Short mmCIF file of C-alpha atoms and ligand atoms in Angstrom, two decimals:
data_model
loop_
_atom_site.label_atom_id
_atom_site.label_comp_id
_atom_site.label_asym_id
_atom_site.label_seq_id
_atom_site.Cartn_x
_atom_site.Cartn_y
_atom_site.Cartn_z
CA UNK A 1 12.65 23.66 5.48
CA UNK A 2 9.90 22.17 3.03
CA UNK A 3 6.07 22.77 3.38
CA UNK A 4 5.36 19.32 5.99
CA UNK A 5 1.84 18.72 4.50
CA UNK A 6 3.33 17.58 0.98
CA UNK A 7 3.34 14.02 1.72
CA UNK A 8 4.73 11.10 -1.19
CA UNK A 9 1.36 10.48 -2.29
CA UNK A 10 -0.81 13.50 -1.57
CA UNK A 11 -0.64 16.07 0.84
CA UNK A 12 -2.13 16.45 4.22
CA UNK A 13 -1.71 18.05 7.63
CA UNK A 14 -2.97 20.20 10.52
CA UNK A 15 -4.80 23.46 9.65
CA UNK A 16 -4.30 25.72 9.63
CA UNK A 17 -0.67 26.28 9.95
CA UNK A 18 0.54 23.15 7.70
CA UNK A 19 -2.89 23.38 5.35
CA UNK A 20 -5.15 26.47 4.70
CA UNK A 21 -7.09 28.93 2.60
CA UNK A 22 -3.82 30.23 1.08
CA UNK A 23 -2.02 27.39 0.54
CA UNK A 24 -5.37 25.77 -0.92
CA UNK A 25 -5.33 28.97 -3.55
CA UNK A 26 -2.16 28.75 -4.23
CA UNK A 27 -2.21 24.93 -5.11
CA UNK A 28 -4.67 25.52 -7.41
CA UNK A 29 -2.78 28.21 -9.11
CA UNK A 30 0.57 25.81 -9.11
CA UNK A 31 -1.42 23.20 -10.37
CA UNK A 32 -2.64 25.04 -13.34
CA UNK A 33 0.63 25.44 -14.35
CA UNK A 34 1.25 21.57 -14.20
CA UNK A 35 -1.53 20.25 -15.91
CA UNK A 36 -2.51 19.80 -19.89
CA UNK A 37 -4.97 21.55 -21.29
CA UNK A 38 -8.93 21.09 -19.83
CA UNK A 39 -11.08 22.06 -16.83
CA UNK A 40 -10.29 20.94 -13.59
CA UNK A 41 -12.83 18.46 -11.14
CA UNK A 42 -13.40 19.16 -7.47
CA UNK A 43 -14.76 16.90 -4.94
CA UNK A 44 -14.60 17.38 -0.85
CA UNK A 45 -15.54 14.91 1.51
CA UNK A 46 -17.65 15.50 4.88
CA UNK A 47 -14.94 17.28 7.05
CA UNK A 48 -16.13 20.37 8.03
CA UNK A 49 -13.29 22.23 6.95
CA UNK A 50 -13.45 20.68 3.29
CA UNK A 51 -15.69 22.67 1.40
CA UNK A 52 -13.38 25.62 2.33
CA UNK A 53 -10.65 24.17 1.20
CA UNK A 54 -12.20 23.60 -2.31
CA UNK A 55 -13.57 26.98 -2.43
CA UNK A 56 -10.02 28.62 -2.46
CA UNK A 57 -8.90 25.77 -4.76
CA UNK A 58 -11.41 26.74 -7.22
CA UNK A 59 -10.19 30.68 -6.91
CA UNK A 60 -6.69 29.83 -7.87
CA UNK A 61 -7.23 27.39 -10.42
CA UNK A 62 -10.20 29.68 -11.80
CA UNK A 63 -7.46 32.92 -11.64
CA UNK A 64 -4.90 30.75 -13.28
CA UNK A 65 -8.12 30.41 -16.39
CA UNK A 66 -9.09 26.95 -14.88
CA UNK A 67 -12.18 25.82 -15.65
CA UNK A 68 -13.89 24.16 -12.88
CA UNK A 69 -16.04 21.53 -12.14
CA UNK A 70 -17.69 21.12 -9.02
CA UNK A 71 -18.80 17.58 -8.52
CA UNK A 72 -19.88 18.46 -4.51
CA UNK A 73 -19.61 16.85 -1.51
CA UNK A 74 -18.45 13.08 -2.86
CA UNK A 75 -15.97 9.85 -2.58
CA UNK A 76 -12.75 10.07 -3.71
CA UNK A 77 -13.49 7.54 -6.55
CA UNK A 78 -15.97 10.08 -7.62
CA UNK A 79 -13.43 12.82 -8.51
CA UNK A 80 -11.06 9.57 -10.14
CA UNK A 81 -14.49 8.24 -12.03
CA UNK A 82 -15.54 11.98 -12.89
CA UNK A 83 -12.12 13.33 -13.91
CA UNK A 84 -11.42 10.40 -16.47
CA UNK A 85 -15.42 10.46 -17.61
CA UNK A 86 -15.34 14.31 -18.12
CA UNK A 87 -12.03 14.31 -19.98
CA UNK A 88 -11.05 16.88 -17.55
CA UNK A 89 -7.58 18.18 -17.56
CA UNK A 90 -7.45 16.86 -13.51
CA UNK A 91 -8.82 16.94 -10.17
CA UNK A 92 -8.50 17.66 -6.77
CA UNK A 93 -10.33 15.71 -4.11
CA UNK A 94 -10.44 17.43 -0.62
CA UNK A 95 -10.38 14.82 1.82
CA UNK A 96 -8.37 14.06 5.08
CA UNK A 97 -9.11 10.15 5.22
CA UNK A 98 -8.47 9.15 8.96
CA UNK A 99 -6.44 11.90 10.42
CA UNK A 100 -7.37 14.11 13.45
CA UNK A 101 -10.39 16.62 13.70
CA UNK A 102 -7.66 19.36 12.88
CA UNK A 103 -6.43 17.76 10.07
CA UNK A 104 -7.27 18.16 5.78
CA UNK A 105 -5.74 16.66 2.71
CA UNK A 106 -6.02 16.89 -1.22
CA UNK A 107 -5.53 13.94 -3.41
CA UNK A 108 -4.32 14.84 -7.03
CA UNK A 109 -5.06 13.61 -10.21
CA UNK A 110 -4.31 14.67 -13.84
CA UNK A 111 -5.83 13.34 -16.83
CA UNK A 112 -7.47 10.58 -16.99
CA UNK A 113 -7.22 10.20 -13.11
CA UNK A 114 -3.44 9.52 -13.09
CA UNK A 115 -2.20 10.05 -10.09
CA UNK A 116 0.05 12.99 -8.82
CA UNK A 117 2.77 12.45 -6.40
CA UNK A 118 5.81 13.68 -5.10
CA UNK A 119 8.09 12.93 -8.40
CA UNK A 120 5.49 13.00 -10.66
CA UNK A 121 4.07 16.77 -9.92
CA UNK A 122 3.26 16.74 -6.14
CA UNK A 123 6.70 18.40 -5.09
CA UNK A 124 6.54 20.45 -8.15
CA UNK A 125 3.76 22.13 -6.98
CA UNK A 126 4.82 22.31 -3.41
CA UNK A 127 8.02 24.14 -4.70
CA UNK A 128 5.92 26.42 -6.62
CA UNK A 129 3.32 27.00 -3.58
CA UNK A 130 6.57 27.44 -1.32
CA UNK A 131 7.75 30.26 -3.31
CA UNK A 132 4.70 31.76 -4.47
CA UNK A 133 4.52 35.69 -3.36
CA UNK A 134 2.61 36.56 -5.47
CA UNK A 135 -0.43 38.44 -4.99
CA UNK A 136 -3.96 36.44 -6.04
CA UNK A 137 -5.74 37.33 -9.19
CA UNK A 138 -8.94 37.59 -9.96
CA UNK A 139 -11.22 34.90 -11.77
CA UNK A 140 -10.71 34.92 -15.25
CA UNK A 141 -12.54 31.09 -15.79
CA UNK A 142 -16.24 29.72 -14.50
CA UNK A 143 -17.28 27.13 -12.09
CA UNK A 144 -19.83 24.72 -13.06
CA UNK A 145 -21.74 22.70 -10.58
CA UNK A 146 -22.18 18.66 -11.59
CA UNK A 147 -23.94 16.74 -9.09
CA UNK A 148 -25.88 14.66 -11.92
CA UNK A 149 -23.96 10.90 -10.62
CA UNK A 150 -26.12 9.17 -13.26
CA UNK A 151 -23.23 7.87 -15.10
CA UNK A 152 -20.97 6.87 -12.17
CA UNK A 153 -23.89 4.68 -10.91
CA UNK A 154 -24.71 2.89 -14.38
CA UNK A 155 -20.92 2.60 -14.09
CA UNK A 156 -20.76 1.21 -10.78
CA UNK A 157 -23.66 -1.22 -11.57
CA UNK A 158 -22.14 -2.50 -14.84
CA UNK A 159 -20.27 -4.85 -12.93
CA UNK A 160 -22.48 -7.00 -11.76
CA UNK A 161 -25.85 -8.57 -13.82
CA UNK A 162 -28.78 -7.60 -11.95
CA UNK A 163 -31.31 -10.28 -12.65
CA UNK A 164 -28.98 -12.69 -10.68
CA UNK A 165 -28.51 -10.96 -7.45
CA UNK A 166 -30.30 -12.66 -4.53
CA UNK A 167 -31.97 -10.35 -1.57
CA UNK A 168 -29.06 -11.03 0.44
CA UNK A 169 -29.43 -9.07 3.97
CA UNK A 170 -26.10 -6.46 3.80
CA UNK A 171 -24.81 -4.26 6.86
CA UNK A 172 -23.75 -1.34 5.61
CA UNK A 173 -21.33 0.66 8.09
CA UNK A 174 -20.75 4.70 6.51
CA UNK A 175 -18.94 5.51 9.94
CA UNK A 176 -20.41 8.68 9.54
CA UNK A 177 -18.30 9.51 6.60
CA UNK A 178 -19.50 9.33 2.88
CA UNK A 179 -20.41 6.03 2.05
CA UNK A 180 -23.83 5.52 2.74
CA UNK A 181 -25.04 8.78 0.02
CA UNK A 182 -23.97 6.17 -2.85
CA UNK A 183 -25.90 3.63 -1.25
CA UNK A 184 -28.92 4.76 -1.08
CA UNK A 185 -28.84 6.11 -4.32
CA UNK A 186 -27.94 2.42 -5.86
CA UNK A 187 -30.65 0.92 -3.41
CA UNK A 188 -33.48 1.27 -5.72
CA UNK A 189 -31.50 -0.61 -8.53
CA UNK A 190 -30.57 -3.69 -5.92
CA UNK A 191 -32.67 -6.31 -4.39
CA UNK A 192 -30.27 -6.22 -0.98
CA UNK A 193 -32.17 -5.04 2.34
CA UNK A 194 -29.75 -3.27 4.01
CA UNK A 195 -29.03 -2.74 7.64
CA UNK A 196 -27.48 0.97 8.13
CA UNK A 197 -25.33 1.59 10.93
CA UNK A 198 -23.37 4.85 10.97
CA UNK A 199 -25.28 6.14 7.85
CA UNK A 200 -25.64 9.90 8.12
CA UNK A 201 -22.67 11.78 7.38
CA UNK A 202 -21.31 14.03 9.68
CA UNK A 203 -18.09 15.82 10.22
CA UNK A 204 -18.02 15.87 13.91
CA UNK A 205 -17.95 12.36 13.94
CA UNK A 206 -20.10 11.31 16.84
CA UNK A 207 -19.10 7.41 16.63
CA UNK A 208 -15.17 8.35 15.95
CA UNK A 209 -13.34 9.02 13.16
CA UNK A 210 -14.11 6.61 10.41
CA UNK A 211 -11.44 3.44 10.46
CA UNK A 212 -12.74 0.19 10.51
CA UNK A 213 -9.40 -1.82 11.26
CA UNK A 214 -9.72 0.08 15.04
CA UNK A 215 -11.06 -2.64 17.19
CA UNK A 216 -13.76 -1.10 18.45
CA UNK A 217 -14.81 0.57 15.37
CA UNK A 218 -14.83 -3.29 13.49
CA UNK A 219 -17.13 -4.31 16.60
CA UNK A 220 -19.83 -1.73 15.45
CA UNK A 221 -20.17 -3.87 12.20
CA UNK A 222 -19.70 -7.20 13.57
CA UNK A 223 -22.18 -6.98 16.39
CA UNK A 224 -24.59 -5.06 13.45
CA UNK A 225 -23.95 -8.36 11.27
CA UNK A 226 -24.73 -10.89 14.10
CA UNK A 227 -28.05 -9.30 15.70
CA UNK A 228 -29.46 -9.30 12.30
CA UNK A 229 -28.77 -12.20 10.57
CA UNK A 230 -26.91 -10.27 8.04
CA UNK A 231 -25.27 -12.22 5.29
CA UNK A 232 -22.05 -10.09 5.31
CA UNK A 233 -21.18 -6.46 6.56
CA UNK A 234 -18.95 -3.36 4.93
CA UNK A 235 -17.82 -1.06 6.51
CA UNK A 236 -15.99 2.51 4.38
CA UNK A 237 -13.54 5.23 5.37
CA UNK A 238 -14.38 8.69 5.46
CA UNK A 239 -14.00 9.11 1.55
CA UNK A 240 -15.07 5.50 0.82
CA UNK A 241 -12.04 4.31 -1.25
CA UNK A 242 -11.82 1.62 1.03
CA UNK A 243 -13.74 -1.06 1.74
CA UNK A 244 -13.77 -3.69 4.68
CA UNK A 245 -15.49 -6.93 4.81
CA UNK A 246 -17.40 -9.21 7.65
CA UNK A 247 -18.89 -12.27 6.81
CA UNK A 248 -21.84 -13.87 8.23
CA UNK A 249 -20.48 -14.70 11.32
CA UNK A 250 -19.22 -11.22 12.50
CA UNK A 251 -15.77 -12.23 11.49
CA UNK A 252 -13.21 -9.67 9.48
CA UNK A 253 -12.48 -10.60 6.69
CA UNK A 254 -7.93 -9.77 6.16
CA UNK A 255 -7.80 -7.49 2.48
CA UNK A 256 -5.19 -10.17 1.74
CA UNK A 257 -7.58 -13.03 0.88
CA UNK A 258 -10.24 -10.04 -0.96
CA UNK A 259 -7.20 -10.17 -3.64
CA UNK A 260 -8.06 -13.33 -4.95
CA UNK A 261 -11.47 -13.04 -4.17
CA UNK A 262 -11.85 -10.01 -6.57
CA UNK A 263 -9.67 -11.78 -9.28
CA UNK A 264 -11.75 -14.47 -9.38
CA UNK A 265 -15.02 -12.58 -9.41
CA UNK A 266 -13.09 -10.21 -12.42
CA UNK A 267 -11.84 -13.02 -14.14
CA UNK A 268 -15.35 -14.94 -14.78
CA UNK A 269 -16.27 -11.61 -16.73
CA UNK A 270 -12.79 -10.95 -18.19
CA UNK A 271 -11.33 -14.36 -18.82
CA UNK A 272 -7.12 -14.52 -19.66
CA UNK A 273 -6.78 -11.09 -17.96
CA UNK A 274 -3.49 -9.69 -15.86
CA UNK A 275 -3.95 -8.93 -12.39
CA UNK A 276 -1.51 -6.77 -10.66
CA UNK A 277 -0.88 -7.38 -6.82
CA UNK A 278 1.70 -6.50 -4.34
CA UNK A 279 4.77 -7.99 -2.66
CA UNK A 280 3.74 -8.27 0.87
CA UNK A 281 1.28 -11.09 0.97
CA UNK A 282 1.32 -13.39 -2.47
CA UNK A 283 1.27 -16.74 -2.66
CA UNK A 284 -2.67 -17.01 -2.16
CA UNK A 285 -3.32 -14.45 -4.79
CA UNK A 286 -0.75 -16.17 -7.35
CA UNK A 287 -2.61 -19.13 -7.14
CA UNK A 288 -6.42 -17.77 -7.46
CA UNK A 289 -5.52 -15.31 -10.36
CA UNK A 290 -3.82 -18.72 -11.95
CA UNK A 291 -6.47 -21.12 -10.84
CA UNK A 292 -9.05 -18.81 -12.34
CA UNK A 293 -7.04 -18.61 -15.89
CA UNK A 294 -5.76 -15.12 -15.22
CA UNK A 295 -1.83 -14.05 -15.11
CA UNK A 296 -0.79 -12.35 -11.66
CA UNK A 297 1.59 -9.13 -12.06
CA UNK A 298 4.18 -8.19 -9.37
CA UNK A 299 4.25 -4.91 -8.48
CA UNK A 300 5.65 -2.35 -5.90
CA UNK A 301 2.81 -1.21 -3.07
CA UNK A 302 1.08 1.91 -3.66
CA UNK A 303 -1.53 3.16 -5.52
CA UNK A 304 0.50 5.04 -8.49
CA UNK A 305 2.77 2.29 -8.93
CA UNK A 306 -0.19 -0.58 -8.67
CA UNK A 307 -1.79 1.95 -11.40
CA UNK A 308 0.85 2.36 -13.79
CA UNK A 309 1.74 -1.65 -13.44
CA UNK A 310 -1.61 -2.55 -14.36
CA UNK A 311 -1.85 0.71 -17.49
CA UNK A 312 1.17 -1.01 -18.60
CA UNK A 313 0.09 -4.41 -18.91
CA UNK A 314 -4.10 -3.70 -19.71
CA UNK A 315 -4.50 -5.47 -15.94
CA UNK A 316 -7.95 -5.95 -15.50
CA UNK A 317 -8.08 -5.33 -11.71
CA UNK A 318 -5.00 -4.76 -9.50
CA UNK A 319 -5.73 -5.62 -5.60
CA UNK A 320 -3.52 -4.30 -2.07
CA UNK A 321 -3.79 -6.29 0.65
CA UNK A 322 -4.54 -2.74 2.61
CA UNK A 323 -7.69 -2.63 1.45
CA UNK A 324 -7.50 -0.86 -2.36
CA UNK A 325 -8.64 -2.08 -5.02
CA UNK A 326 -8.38 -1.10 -8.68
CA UNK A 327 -10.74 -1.52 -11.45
CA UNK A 328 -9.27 -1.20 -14.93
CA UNK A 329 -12.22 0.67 -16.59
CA UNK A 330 -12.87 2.88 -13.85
CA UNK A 331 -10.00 4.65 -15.01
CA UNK A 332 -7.90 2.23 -13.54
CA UNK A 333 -8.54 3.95 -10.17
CA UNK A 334 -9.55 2.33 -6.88
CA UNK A 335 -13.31 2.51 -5.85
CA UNK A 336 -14.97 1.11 -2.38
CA UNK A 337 -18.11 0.80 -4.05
CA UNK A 338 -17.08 -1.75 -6.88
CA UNK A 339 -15.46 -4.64 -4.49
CA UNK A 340 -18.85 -5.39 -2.65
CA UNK A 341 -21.15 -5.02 -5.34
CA UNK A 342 -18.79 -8.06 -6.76
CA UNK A 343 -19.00 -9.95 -3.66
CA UNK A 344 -22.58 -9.40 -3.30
CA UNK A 345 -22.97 -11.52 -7.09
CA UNK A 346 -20.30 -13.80 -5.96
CA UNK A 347 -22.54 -14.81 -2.90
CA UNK A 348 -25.85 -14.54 -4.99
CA UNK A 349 -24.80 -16.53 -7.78
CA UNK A 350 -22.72 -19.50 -5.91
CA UNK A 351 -25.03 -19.71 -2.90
CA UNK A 352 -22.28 -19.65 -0.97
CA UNK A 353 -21.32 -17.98 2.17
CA UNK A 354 -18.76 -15.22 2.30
CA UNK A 355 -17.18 -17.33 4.59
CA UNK A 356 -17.25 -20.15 2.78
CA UNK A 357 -15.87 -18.29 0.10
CA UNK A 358 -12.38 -17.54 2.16
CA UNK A 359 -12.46 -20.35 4.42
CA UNK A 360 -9.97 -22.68 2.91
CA UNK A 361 -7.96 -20.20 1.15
CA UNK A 362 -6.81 -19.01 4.99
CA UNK A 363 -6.42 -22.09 6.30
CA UNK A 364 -3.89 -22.71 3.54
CA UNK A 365 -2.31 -19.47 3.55
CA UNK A 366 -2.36 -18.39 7.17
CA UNK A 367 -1.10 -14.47 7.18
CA UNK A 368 0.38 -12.78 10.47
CA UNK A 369 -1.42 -9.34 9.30
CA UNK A 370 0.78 -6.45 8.69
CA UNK A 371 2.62 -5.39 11.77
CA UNK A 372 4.67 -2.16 12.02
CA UNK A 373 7.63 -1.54 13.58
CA UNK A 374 8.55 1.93 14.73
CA UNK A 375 12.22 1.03 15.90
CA UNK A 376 15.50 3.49 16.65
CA UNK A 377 17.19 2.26 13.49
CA UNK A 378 15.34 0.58 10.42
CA UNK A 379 18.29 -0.05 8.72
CA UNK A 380 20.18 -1.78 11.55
CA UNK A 381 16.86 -3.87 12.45
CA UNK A 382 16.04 -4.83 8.51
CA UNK A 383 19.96 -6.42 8.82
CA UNK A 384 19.45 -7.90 12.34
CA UNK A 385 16.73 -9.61 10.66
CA UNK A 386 18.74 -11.03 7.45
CA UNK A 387 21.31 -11.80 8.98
CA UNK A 388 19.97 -14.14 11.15
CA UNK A 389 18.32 -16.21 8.07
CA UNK A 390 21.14 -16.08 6.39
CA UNK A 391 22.40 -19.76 7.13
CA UNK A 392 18.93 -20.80 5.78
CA UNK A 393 19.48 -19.46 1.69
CA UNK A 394 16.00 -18.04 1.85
CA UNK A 395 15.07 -16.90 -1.95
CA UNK A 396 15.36 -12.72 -2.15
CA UNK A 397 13.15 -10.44 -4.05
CA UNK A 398 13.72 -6.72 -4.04
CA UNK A 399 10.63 -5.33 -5.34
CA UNK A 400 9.43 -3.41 -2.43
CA UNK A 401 11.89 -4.00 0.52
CA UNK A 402 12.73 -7.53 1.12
CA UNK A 403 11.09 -10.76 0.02
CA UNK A 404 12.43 -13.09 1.78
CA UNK A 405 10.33 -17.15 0.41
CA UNK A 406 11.83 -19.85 2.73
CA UNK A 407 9.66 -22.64 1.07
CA UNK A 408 7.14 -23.41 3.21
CA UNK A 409 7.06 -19.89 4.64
CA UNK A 410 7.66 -15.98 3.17
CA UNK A 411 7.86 -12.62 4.62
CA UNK A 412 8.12 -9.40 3.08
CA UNK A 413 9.85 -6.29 5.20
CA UNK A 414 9.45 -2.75 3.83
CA UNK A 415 9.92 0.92 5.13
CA UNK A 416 6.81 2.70 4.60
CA UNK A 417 6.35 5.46 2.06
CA UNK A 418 3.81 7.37 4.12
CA UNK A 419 5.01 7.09 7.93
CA UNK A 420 8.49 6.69 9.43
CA UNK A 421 7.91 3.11 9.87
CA UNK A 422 8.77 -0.46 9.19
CA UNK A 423 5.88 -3.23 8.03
CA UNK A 424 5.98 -6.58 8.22
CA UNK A 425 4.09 -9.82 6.64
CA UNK A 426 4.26 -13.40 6.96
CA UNK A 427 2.47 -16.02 5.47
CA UNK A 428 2.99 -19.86 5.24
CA UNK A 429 1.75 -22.84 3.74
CA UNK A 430 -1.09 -24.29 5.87
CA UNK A 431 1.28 -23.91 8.95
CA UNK A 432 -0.40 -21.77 11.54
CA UNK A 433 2.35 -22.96 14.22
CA UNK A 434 5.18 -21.67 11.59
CA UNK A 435 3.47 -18.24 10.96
CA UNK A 436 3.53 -17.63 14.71
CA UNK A 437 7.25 -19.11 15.66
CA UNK A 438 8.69 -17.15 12.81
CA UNK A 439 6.37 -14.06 13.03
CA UNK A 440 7.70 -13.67 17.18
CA UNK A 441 11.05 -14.11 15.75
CA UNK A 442 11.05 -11.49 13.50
CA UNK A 443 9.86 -9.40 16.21
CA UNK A 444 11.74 -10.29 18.70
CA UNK A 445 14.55 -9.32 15.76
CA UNK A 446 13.12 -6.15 15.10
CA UNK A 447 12.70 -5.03 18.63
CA UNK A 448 16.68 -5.69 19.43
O1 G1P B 501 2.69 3.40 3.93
P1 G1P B 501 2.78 2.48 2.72
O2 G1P B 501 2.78 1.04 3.21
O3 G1P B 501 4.02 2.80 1.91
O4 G1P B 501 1.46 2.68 1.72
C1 G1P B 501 0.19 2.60 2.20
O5 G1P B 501 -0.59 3.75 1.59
C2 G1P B 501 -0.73 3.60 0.12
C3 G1P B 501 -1.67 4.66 -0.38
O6 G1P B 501 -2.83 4.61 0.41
C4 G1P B 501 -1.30 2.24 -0.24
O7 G1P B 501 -1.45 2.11 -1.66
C5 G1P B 501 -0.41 1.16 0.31
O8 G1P B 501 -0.90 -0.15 -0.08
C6 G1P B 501 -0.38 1.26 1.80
O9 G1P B 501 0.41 0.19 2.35
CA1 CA B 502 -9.70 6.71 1.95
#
């Protein structure tokens, strides 16, 4: 067979028999191979587990002549801001985002934080790891240790003009995980008083594993946000490259409608910019990027294709409705920290609510949420569900699975890339009675 953990977009699984010490060392040493020339940056987030994982990264890349550079116990945006900001050859973030308490991962990068996947390097390596008997040399390169983060938080507060943020009252929801290091250390630059919950990371996660779209993990912010008055809430993941919203009123705030919120806050600063967005939910984010003067780009979900889209076209900011969202001079890379530092000016400098902010835009575009599908056959289903619109000429779009825009309603229908599954969104315009008639359809479709 093939080595499981190697995954489309980076590689994860169970250690230590699909991820360990060795096969940490010898990534680095395949990945030395695969890279140009420069040192190498390395980042782990607060698994407990990570740090080894990085340790035995650093010996192969360091026995392959590697420079490396340790930037510590960090977000995954750190290693993207850090790689690009160093000029470093690549880097490796050890992380294992939401999976089990057994469970580790690497993301990959290359220079100037572009990404490494499976066709672009990822498999490369794993075919080099998978054959690799060789026995591991010594250090012939030196680790450095970087913790100074002064330039990723000038960077991180460039966005936003200081002098105009209000003391707005902000929950701020770590989950245990990373997030709330980065806060406190942009807290003395910010007039916000915040309201920690979850703050101190640790790796045996006491109050679950970090994922705020569980139920009962979004309830920790929401209640947080309502006993205190709080303006809005955000909640991270474990590595804090994703960001989830709750507005005054406790409510969750869908990543589809933070599209065009983020456009809109980019394009005040940027004015005429591209903005590149996904197939799944659009019509709300078309109109936004427009509204606000900038031009929307369609692109294929998924980070490496969002970020070569918007590298292609000098997109100012690039937005998934899953939460990602990617900031053209942060090395085009997706940062958690960025979106709410945005929507904190937005709110300052508007005086209005988050809320208010989204209100009407989902009352006009009503969204079912993605829903996934694991069925018997995806194939079979995806044509069960054509099929039966057929006799209605719906307008098709191929992009990322099917687009299928009926007029006054759209839904887009796509295998994932990193699960065995099938995903679906609807959306309509201003029809709430539509979106749930054709959204129990579908299903109902899927399901048969
Ligand atoms: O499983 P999917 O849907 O192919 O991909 C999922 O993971 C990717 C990497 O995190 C994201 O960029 C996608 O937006 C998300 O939907
Ligand atoms: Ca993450």
């Amino acid at each position: 067979m093939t080595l499981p953990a190697f995954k489309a977009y980076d590689i994860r699984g169970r250690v230590p028999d699909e991820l360990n010490e060795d096969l940490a060392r010898r990534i680095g040493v395949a990945l030395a191979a695969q890279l140009d020339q420069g040192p190498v940056v390395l980042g782990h987030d607060v698994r407990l587990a990570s740090p080894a994982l990085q340790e035995a990264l650093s010996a192969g890349l360091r026995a392959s002549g590697r420079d490396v550079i340790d930037i510590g116990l960090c977000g995954t945006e750190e290693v993207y801001f850090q790689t690009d900001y160093l000029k470093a050859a690549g880097g490796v973030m050890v992380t294992a985002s939401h999976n089990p308490m057994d469970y580790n991962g690497m993301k990959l990068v290359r220079e100037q934080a572009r990404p490494i996947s499976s066709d672009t390097g990822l498999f490369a390596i794993r075919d080099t790891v998978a054959a690799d008997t060789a026995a591991p040399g010594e250090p012939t390169a030196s680790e450095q240790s970087r913790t100074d983060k002064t330039a990723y938080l000038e960077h991180l507060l460039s966005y936003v003009d200081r002098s105009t943020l209000k003391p707005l009252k902000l929950v701020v929801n770590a989950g245990n995980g990373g997030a709330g290091l980065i806060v406190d250390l942009l807290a003395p630059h910010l007039p916000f008083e915040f309201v920690r919950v979850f703050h101190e990371p640790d790796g045996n996660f006491p109050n679950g594993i970090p994922n705020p779209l569980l139920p009962e993990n979004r309830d920790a912010t929401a209640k947080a946000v309502k006993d205190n008055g709080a303006d809005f809430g955000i909640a991270w993941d474990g590595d804090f490259d994703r960001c989830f919203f709750f507005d005054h009123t406790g409510r969750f705030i869908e990543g589809y409608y933070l599209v065009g919120l983020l456009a809109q806050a980019i394009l005040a600063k940027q004015p005429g910019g591209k903005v590149v967005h996904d197939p799944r939910l659009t019509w709300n984010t078309v109109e936004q990027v427009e509204e606000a003067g900038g031009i929307p780009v369609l692109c294929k979900s998924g980070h490496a294709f969002i970020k070569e889209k918007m590298r292609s076209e000098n997109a100012v900011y690039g937005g998934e409705m899953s939460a990602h969202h990617y900031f053209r001079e942060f090395a085009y890379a997706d940062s958690g920290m960025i979106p709410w530092l945005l929507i904190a000016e937005l709110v300052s400098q508007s005086g209005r609510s988050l809320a208010d902010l989204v209100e009407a835009r989902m009352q006009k575009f009503p969204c079912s949420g993605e829903i996934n599908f694991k069925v018997a056959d995806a194939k079979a289903s995806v044509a069960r569900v054509m099929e039966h619109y057929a006799s209605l000429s719906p307008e098709l779009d191929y992009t990322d699975g099917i687009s299928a825009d009926f007029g006054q309603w759209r839904f887009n229908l796509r295998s994932s890339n990193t699960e065995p599954l099938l995903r679906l969104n609807v959306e309509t315009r201003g029809d709430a009675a539509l979106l749930e008639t054709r959204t129990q359809e579908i299903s109902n479709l899927l399901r048969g």
